[PDB]
Paper text:
Haloalkane dehalogenases (HLDs) (EC 3.8.1.5) are hydrolytic enzymes that cleave carbon-halogen bonds in a broad range of halogenated aliphatic compounds, resulting in a corresponding alcohol, a halide ion, and a proton. The tertiary structure of HLDs is comprised of two domains: an α/β-hydrolase core domain and a helical cap domain. HLDs are divided into three subfamilies, HLD-I, HLD-II, and HLD-III, according to the composition of their catalytic residues and the anatomy of the cap domain. Based on the sequences of modern haloalkane dehalogenases from the subfamily II, the most common ancestor of thoroughly characterized enzymes LinB from Sphingobium japonicum UT26 and DmbA from Mycobacterium bovis 5033/66 was in silico predicted, recombinantly produced and structurally characterized.
The ancestral enzyme AncLinB-DmbA was crystallized using the sitting-drop vapor-diffusion method, yielding rod-like crystals that diffracted X-rays to 1.5 Å resolution. The structural organization of AncLinB-DmbA is similar to other HLDs-II subfamily members; it is composed of two compact domains, a cap domain and a main domain. The catalytic triad contains nucleophile D109, catalytic acid E133, and catalytic base H273. W110 and N39 act as halide-stabilizing residues in AncLinB-DmbA. The chloride anion is coordinated by two halide stabilizing residues with distances between the Nε1 atom in W110 and the Nδ1 atom in N39 of 3.29 and 3.37 Å, respectively. The 3D structure of AncLinB-DmbA was superposed with its closely related structures of descendant enzymes LinB and DmbA. As it is shown in Figure 2a the enzyme structure is highly conserved (RMSD of Cα atoms of AncLinB-DmbA and LinB is 0.778 Å and AncLinB-DmbA and DmbA is 0.895 Å), however, some small differences between the structure of ancestral and descendant enzymes were identified. Furthermore, some differences are presented in several loops: the loop near the N-terminus of AncLinB-DmbA forms an additional small helix and another additional helix is formed in AncLinB-DmbA between α3 and β6, which is not presented in DmbA and LinB structures. The AncLinB-DmbA and LinB contain one main tunnel p1 (highlighted in blue) and one slot tunnel p2a, while DmbA has one main tunnel p1 and two slot tunnels p2a and p2b. The radius of the entrance in AncLinB-DmbA is the largest among the descendants: it is ∼2.5 Å, compared to DmbA ∼2.2 Å and LinB ∼1.4 Å. The volume of the active site cavity of AncLinB-DmbA is 460 Å3, which is larger compared to both LinB (406 Å3) and DmbA (375 Å3).
Residue numbers in the entry: 5 to 296
Amino acid sequence: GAEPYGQKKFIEIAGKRMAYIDEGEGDPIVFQHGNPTSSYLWRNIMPHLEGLGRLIACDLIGMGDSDKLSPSGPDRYSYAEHRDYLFALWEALDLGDNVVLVIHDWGSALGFDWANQHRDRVQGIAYMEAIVTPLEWADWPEEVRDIFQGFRSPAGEEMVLENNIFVERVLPGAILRQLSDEEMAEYRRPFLNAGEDRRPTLSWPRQIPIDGEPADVVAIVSDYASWLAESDIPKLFINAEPGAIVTGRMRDFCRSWPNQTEITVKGAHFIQEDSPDEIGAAIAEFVRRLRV
Ligand SMILES: [Cl-]
Ligand code: NA
Ligand code: NA
Ligand code: NA
Ligand code: NA
């Protein structure tokens, strides 16, 4: 269960190498990770979709085996910069117009935004522990609120760049099981060096739309949230118990979305590490249904 899935391919986008999985034939099934993960997140999910489509899992810029930006610093790895690289990669990959999106965390902001911009090219959306509408601090799990407000303060650089707290604390804190040393090492790999190599993992929490900031991301999220609440695009909502960011009022909101089926699995935030086989089977049933 610790082994990566497949063998990564590489494409140069805007002078940087992006790494991604691309296996199989047919209409794509696109799996997008978030913070502080990579395509690896999906390694026990993707085998359940074998033979049902072209399976794609991209590593965001500066993450996984994609190259780092230079010079890195606080103005880099914003949502929009990530979107520039990922959307370019998706274009380069010639996805066509029957794309299924499988999305999590910042992967869900990116994927929901993509779908909102390309409504005619998305066959269906499976999402989990996603950014579904703009947040307030009350929506955030109490037990990590102090850490997240830390990230979103000048203390963030020390917390992440020097102390790697997102990788070392937040990630295993939001997985119910204990990862193996080997799993751990894979997740740490892109961020082993203190300093700017760890930047994406600090830029990301600074982009979360909370209390109206950052405004640009709030607007992007509001836009797709309003669209999804009325859209007839097929959806699969994978709810988690106890879950983390899709709880309370946020969970009520996404449950109101049209043309959607839902499952519940055990998990906190990184639920792929806790309930892969249920997740995989639900996505396989959804894709089979859409593609019959
Ligand atoms: Cl984050
Ligand atoms: Na991915
Ligand atoms: Na992807
Ligand atoms: Na990216
Ligand atoms: Na980032």
